[PDB]
Symmetry: C3
Subunit: 211 residues, 3 copies
């Protein structure tokens, strides 16, 4: 089809059922929404993510370390359930019965540029500097005023997992949010549970499957 769309997650950002990998062997739940539009083999889309201190492990200092996490968008999860690393709930593609293949990173482009994720499925975070390749987008997130969020980066990488049973690539999205030095520490064990961050829908583009 000429234009196809794909979405997963909760557009109201109220279901904290999405799995994020954090640095140093950690995990957190977030609410997220993803929309992709594919035309002519080129895919443009947005990701939007939110979470609060209550879901987050209590190690490190967010002011010095940044708030870092990653999620995986997995278009072939309909035919390869093991690829659903972020534990999404099941997409809507339009028009119905457009293949999800359209939203996987291009296979020819992915050769030798793809990141192979750690194969333990509760711990697939990869620091920016060990990603094989990526594209970088700059944005500003918002959140509780005391966090003093100043900026953020998104990296978009083509990825695969050894646990996958199919040929189709995934999209790894790594996030880094930064605070002004006077912000409070998000990872502080006595920090209020209700401290939260919320990104805008961050746009990205990549090459998908084509004829």
């Amino acid at each position: 089809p000429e234009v196809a769309t794909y979405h997963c997650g909760d557009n109201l950002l109220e279901s904290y059922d999405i799995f994020a990998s954090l640095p140093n062997t950690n995990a957190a739940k977030v609410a997220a929404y993803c929309r992709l539009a594919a035309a002519g083999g080129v895919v443009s889309g947005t990701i939007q993510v939110t979470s609060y201190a209550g879901r987050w492990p209590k190690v490190g200092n967010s002011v010095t370390d940044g708030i870092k996490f990653a999620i995986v968008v997995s278009p072939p999860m309909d035919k390869d359930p093991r690829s659903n690393l972020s534990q999404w709930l099941g997409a809507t593609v339009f028009p119905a019965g457009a293949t999800t293949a359209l939203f996987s990173p291009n296979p020819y482009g992915s050769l030798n540029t793809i990141t192979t994720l750690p194969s333990i499925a509760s711990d697939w975070y990869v620091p920016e500097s060990n990603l094989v390749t990526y594209t970088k987008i700059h944005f500003k997130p918002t959140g509780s005023q005391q966090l003093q969020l100043a900026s953020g980066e998104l990296v978009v990488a083509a990825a695969k997992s050894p646990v996958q049973t199919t040929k189709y690539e995934l999209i790894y999205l790594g996030f880094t949010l930064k605070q002004n030095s006077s912000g409070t520490n998000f990872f502080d064990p006595n920090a209020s549970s209700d401290l939260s961050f919320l990104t805008p829908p961050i746009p990205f583009t990549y090459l998908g499957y084509y004829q």
Copy 2:
């Protein structure tokens, strides 16, 4: 419709009738052209802007402060004339009678990420660091050789004005142009009137209305 387009402004960049807001309760007129294409609820587009010293406030120093200004793109201005903050003299949509709603930042995405503009129609500039959320693009502008323009940033923020009568969101575009330290001061009262800057068409993407 599958693909819809929107444009406003003068593609020949000869009508200096677009109102730009500046730092410190100043304003300037610019010529501008904006084109958006929406497919699958994702919108990609460009903005191009030009102006000359004659039209610009003689205060501060552009070399140390940068040249800063903002314009608003306002898709719902056909049904809410008060939202036309930059005072575009009309807009065209194709195919005819596609709703302008398609080009407004997505309402679910906009919740809690939107910036509320100062409520006065002639003074709505918001410094980058007070924008609630945004996406950043880096470019290089051109202009009179003696300005020695080195680079620029565009920030794209979803916004709304208290003066609006509808729920449809606007796009706030904040610009910063930077000069090499030996360039002449654009804001100097004795500067030649003809000193000008001109951006290329700067591309941006955001999430719009969908089903």
Copy 3:
């Protein structure tokens, strides 16, 4: 047509028959693939490039200078063969008989923002700071692990050559890849021929021809 596509180069990246212009009046052969999708006057696409040390001039130091080169995408080469500066073997447009004009940078946007390339036509490299206007994209390339490739920038500029016989603009893509200070020198005369870099498909957007 609503959506048109354009591609040139080898998607398997095995034919090192593409010319890239280099600093100091040098040139190198690369393998490259470019895909563009045009909707509503707005063009999005990717470029992917790879090459190895064997094909590269042995001067300077890549660690301190960076690995810099440029290629030209030339949509009107079907009607203006002289505009084929990077020497693509041909291009494919879909649907067949869609005009290649759609993929040229917009003519109204291009006036006064366009870069005029040097004329002796293997060495039309323009340093970033000499380009009239551009848009900048940040990415991370990959390659031989001893290169220690850390990051890269792509600049997208509208361009023309004095040797062209038509009005249609070209796309100049300038690359800079950077290495960690401990990486080996790609330009070392003793360096293994097989050292290589490979970018991901890097996405970009620009304004093309419209009605």
